[PDB]
Amino acid sequence: QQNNIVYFDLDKYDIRSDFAQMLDAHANFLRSNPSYKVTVEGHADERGTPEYNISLGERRANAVKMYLQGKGVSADQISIVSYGKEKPAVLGHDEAAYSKNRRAVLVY
Secondary structure (H helix, E strand, O other), X not given: OXXXXXXXXXXXXXXXXXXXXXXXXXXXHHHOOOOOOEEEEEOOOOOOOXXXXXXXXXXXXXXXXXXXXXXXXXXXXEEEEEOOOOOXXXXXXXXXXXXXXXXXXXXX
């Protein structure tokens, strides 16, 4: 959860204002280093079918990709992968765990 994680609200994949700055820092880094590549890994909490979550995780990873592309990062430097609700960051059946799992992580 440090300088590379975007968190989301239940069933949403929009990027909140709160994360724009952290994301701008990554865009600046990638833009000034055209040979660097980053992978955005999207996730979802355990509520709902596996397929619904794979899709929601993809839209979340995609949202980050599009935000970075909106800041001039080349589409070639960014790839996305969705783990659905298959790779949680925290086990547990409550909102404390879930909120920590609805996320997209920039991985180098």
